[PDB]
Amino acid sequence: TPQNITDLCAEYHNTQIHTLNDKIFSYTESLAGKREMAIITFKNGATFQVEVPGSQHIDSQKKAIERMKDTLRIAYLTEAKVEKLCVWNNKTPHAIAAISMAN
Amino acid sequence: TPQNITDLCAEYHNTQIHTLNDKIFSYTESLAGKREMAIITFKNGATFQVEVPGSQHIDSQKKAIERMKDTLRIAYLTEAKVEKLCVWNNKTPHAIAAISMAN
Amino acid sequence: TPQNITDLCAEYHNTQIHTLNDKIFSYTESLAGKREMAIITFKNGATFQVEVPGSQHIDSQKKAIERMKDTLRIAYLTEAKVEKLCVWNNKTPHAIAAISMAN
Amino acid sequence: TPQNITDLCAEYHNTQIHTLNDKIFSYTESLAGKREMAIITFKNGATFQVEVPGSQHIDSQKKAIERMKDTLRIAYLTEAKVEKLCVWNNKTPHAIAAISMAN
Amino acid sequence: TPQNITDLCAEYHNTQIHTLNDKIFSYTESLAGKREMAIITFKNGATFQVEVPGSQHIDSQKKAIERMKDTLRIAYLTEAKVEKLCVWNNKTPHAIAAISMAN
């Protein structure tokens, strides 16, 4: 069981770590069919998505996808600093697998 | 997969972007039968709804609809600046498909 | 489709609008069986409930009843000004159908 | 239908009202099997639980049990003043049935 | 039924109490399949996880695991002081069984 976001991100090829140490610049949320997703950006220009839940996601993952969108919204609205994002780099925007918040 | 609300909105028919760059002026919600909905207004008069859930709303739209109502409520209470809305404009009040917030 | 809380309230029999323009004075919540409800009051002594879910409600209302209790709790804790309430006046305490918040 | 927590408490056997008029000193929460519960304390020593969901609860209470734990958690973090608690006194710690918060 | 986290912790095997009396330093969350988990750390270097739900967890534990991650997130964002953690010391990181917060 990984002890931090780096070790978890290492479990996957084609994921990569981004260190932002910054608050989210914008938060975008959609309920449109087949675009039930979230998109965040940072002032450095970086853009990331939470994937649309699909048949490729087991049910436990779909539930965690909903959690992640909860986390990003309240992080945005509290101006909480994001430390790192672990993101799949084979999707555009890169897709969030894990997030850390610290200080 | 789009990277922002404007490109996401261009992927559908019967949608348009509204640019507000303002906080929500009023939040209204109802539990009354057949009107289980939320309504928001802006000081310029613009009025929008989150639609009552129905049979046109498909799989994971059901969760996204509830999340949107959560988001509008917490956005209203935090006075978060709303940047743009993607809305379905074949309904009145315009039905929100997506929202973007930027400081 | 109604555009605001007053038009919405007009669509139902035995309802009326209370214009409070004030924060919630008390929030009360119960989990006891058959009394799973919420009660709020205002400075002026006005008392309102969120009814227990029962046979008078249709399936579409079930999530909305839970949302409304969420809304009243966070409204109370933020000291948010509630503008109007649409209530069924054939219940005691009057039963909330819709809420608007502005300011 | 009762109009306040005191009237609601009197509708049940083995209940009593505690008047605290104080914020919550401590919030404890457990996910261990058979102890999925919450325990709160006040500064005077009073200790109360939200019971583990079991057969003694009707289905309607399950949702309300989860809500009560949500409410105690956020009440604690916001240092909200708890007015009164309705509890079952045939359980140790006394088990919460209803809570009133008042400004 | 135990009256505090220390007594609750003693009911289980392979558990131990950690007394932190500090806010959470970092909150980490993953949505990767079969890694749906949360990790928190404190400035004393202690690292703890909320376990991935599965097998070891009955029905009521699943709900409680999700609640626990909700609680740690909002505790982190509010910088609430956590008093103690009851953890299974037969997992790495030690897995959280219960949390106490005291203000």
Record: contact B3-A93, CB cut-off 8 A: yes
B55 contact residues in C (CB cutoff 8 A): none
Q: What is the CATH number of the domain that holds D32?
A: 2.40.50.110
Q: What is the largest CA-CA distance in chain D?
A: 37
Is B95:B40 a contact under the CB 8 Å cutoff?
no
Alpha carbon of B39: minimum distance to chain C alpha carbons (Å) = 7
C97 to chain B, any CB pair closer than 8 A? The answer is yes
Q: What is the CA radius of gyration of chain C?
A: 13
Q: What's the rounded Cα separation, in Å, for the pair B63 and B65?
A: 5
- Where do runs of H (alpha helix) occur along chain E? 5-10, 59-78
Tell me which residue in B1, B65, B83 faces A92 most closely, judged by beta carbons: B1
Is C95:D3 a contact under the CB 8 Å cutoff?
no
In one-letter notation, the amino acid at residue B84 is K
First to last CA, chain A: 24
Q: B86 - beta bridge partners?
A: B17, B98
Record: contact E103-D23, CB cut-off 8 A: yes
Record: contact E98-D52, CB cut-off 8 A: no
CA atoms within 13 A on the CB side of C101: 26
CA atoms within 13 A on the CB side of A41: 14
CA atoms within 13 A on the CB side of B35: 22
The residue of E1, E56, E73, E91 whose CB has the most chain D CBs within 10 angstroms, and thus the best one to mutate to test that interface, is E1
Kindly list the partner chains of chain C, i.e. chains with 3 or more CB atom pairs below 8 Å: B, D
Chains E and D touch (3+ CB pairs under 8 A): yes
A32 contact residues in B (CB cutoff 8 A): 8, 11-12, 15, 61, 86, 97-98
Bridging pattern class, strands C26-30 and C38-41: antiparallel
Angle at D69 between CA D66 and CA D73, to 5 degrees: 145
Tell me which residue in D28, D73, D77 faces E100 most closely, judged by beta carbons: D28
Q: What's the rounded Cα separation, in Å, for the pair B5 and D39?
A: 44
Record: contact C25-D103, CB cut-off 8 A: yes
How is residue A101 written in tokens?
């918040």
Tell me which residue in D60, D71, D103 faces C36 most closely, judged by beta carbons: D60
CA atoms within 13 A on the CB side of D4: 13
Kindly list the partner chains of chain A, i.e. chains with 3 or more CB atom pairs below 8 Å: B, E
- In E24-102, DSSP assigns E strands to 26-30, 37-41, 47-50, 81-88, 94-102
Q: What's the rounded Cα separation, in Å, for the pair B71 and E71?
A: 19
Q: Could you please report the per-residue DSSP string of chain A? A: --SSHHHHHHTSTTEEEEEEEEE-SEEEEE-STT--EEEEE-TTS-EEEEPPP-TTS-HHHHHHHHHHHHHHHHHHHHTPEEEEEEEETTSSSEEEEEEEE--
Least Cα distance to A1 among B12, E32, E51 occurs for E51
Q: What's the rounded Cα separation, in Å, for the pair D21 and C39?
A: 18
Kindly state the helix (H) or strand (E) to which residue D84 belongs, with its residue range.
strand D82-88
Burial D37-72, CB ≥16 within 10 A → b, else e: bbbbbbeeebbbbbbbbeeebeebbebbbbbbbbbb
Question: In chain D, how many domains are there?
Answer: 1
Cβ contacts of residue D54 below 8 Å, gap of 6+? none
What residues make up the domain containing E41?
1-103
What is the resolution of the experimental data for this entry, in Å?
2.1
Record: contact E60-D36, CB cut-off 8 A: yes
